[PDB]
Design an enzyme around this catalytic site. Structure first.
Site, PDB file in Angstrom:
ATOM      1  N   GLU B  51      53.416  31.138  44.627  1.00 53.57           N
ATOM      2  CA  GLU B  51      52.785  30.886  46.095  1.00 53.57           C
ATOM      3  C   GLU B  51      52.027  30.024  46.964  1.00 53.57           C
ATOM      4  O   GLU B  51      50.669  30.033  46.556  1.00 53.57           O
ATOM      5  CB  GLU B  51      52.165  32.642  45.941  1.00 53.57           C
ATOM      6  CG  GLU B  51      52.478  33.586  45.577  1.00 53.57           C
ATOM      7  CD  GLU B  51      51.959  34.928  45.443  1.00 53.57           C
ATOM      8  OE1 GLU B  51      50.923  34.848  44.846  1.00 53.57           O
ATOM      9  OE2 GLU B  51      52.143  35.762  45.495  1.00 53.57           O
ATOM     10  N   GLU B 127      58.920  38.012  39.152  1.00 46.19           N
ATOM     11  CA  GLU B 127      58.217  38.864  39.720  1.00 46.19           C
ATOM     12  C   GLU B 127      58.996  40.177  39.442  1.00 46.19           C
ATOM     13  O   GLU B 127      59.706  40.189  40.991  1.00 46.19           O
ATOM     14  CB  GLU B 127      56.860  38.131  40.306  1.00 46.19           C
ATOM     15  CG  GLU B 127      55.759  37.274  39.269  1.00 46.19           C
ATOM     16  CD  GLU B 127      55.159  37.247  40.163  1.00 46.19           C
ATOM     17  OE1 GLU B 127      54.149  37.840  41.074  1.00 46.19           O
ATOM     18  OE2 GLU B 127      54.371  35.830  40.317  1.00 46.19           O
TER      19      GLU B 127
END
Ligand code: NA
Ligand code: NA
Ligand code: NA
Ligand code: NA
Lengths: 409, 204
Positions: B51, B127
């Site tokens: 991220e 994820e």
């Protein structure tokens, strides 16, 4: 069997137009186009001979070109003295598509230098480009969504004899029911069919009259070089006849004849003589080396059918198989036999969600039922076996969206 | 093995990673990771971080790894899960059949992602299946797809253990605390607990 299509007499002058091909190439935004017309002649070549190709948009002459015979240098021995290629520029051409079937008229004149006409041929011209890019089938640079259907030439009273009224009736029903494509299962259609598709607007898959489904294995003949000549003529003569029709956007090597070496040869032959249209074929697994399009028949949306050697993978899964990059358009799907089409919506939800799933052709347009009469002389629809014909396959000849008389199912 | 690089809070997320002035700091977090763990056989994939959007710095370091160690694929989810900085389509929380056409960085149904025009890479979610509290609903849907689609090669559940901390009451008894329980503010309360097991490793 029999003489089921027209019989006619054509008179041509000794010096004649023996063949002509029309091509339309475009610039990146389709705002510019070049119409290339190659003309071939037979008879005696004279220097005074000329060929004029003119392009017409309605009653307005868009362009015109003239040149004597004699083509460019081809090889060590020269070029074709009996041919000539005319090139015409067209600014902002009105593009052809099923949505708006804009058409131009191309007139090919064989004449003498002093202006005396010898003879003339012509055809309808549709400015459109068909090409597969980055996995998608593009028409004028846009990715198509095929809403097609397979259609046999069948009439309840006349059998396999076609007439205009019926062709038009089929075409109107198709368009009125949101179809934009038709597949000629499984042979070249009556010539008028292509003219109507060019004018009404329908994407056509022209298919060579080759089907050896009954062999064991299915490719016993298609893999045999001794049957290559016979097969080639069925593919080559189809192209020589319909290559100028803009409604034809895809060539088909035939149907259910497994996959043989003859398929690869003829596949390459087409790509070589006509790079303007993709080539497809379902035999041998729907994704062989003889097809530019993954065109399975009856492959389901989510459920895999792992048949040995020729499995029908879920279309969503088929697209992402290791190494696969081609677009997928079912040559046949949603078998409309009797009370059917259950689950149709599932196909369309996938076509819209997946870019590379670009539709398919339903099987099929009309029931192949025939008309018989009882003692009182009343008509009733008959099928396999109702003629003493045996063996037969009973009602499997009826899988249409409409009845033999065109009443909708 | 993933580099210690996350700039999630920036706006946009790649403000620092696309800035050539932060390249030095970033390259060290990547280069020193590889020099230390490149001999472990258990490490099969190098990750450029997490991220931090997708910046030019990601491309340079992606290329650096491919150059010093051609034995392991390099992956990175930032900027869309399928940028030029990753050998693997590695989205986080992409769903099995439903698309989530977010602007710029959409999360396509994993089945659809694989076959987008021109795509050819394997897809392994970095994820998926957020195990926060009473969760893991629809988990079986992921595995049916993984087994049916060759290029869908699984994923990494999020995550292993709840990040709860032990605190004691006046009677000296322990209890599990989360965001804000230490006067820490602002906080994100219980979002630090997303595991398949409790902090003491008792199974959920
Ligand atoms: Na589509
Ligand atoms: Na049938
Ligand atoms: Na898999
Ligand atoms: Na969390």
């Amino acid at each position: 069997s029999g003489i089921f299509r027209d019989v006619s007499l054509l008179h041509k002058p000794t010096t004649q137009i023996s063949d002509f091909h029309v091509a339309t190439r475009f610039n990146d935004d389709f705002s510019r186009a070049v119409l290339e017309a190659e003309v071939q002649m037979c008879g005696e070549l004279r220097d005074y001979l000329r060929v004029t190709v003119s392009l017409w948009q309605g009653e307005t002459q868009v362009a015109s070109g003239t040149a004597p015979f004699g083509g460019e240098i081809i090889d060590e021995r020269g070029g074709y003295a009996d041919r000539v290629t005319l090139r015409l520029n067209v600014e902002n051409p009105k593009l052809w598509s099923a949505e708006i079937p804009n058409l131009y008229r191309a007139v090919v004149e064989l004449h003498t230098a002093d202006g005396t006409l010898i003879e003339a041929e012509a055809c309808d011209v549709g400015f459109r480009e068909v090409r597969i890019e980055n996995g998608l089938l593009l028409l004028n640079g846009k990715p198509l969504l095929i809403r097609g259907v397979n259609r046999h030439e069948h009439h309840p009273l006349h059998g396999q004899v076609m007439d205009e009224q019926t062709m038009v009736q089929d075409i109107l029903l198709m368009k009125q029911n949101n179809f934009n494509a038709v597949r000629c299962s499984h042979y070249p259609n009556h010539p008028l069919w292509y003219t109507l598709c060019d004018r009404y607007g329908l994407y056509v898959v022209d298919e060579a009259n080759i089907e050896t489904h009954g062999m064991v294995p299915m490719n016993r003949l298609t893999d045999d070089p001794r049957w290559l000549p016979a097969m080639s003529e069925r593919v080559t003569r189809m192209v020589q006849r319909d290559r100028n029709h803009p409604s034809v956007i895809i060539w088909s090597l035939g149907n259910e004849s497994g996959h043989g070496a003859n398929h690869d040869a003829l596949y390459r032959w087409i790509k070589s003589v006509d790079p303007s249209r993709p080539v497809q074929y379902e035999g041998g697994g729907a994704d062989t080396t003889a097809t530019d399009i993954i065109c399975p028949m009856y492959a389901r949306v989510d459920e895999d059918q792992p048949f040995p050697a020729v499995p029908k993978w879920s279309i969503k899964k088929w697209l992402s198989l290791p190494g696969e990059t081609r677009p997928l358009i079912l040559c046949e799907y949603a078998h409309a036999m009797g009370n059917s089409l259950g689950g149709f919506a599932k196909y369309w939800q996938a076509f819209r969600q997946y870019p590379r799933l670009q539709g398919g052709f339903v099987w099929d347009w009309v029931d192949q039922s025939l008309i018989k009469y009882d003692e009182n002389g009343n008509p009733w629809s008959a099928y396999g076996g109702d003629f003493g014909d045996t063996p037969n396959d009973a009602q499997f000849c009826m899988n249409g969206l409409v009845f033999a008389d065109r009443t909708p199912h």
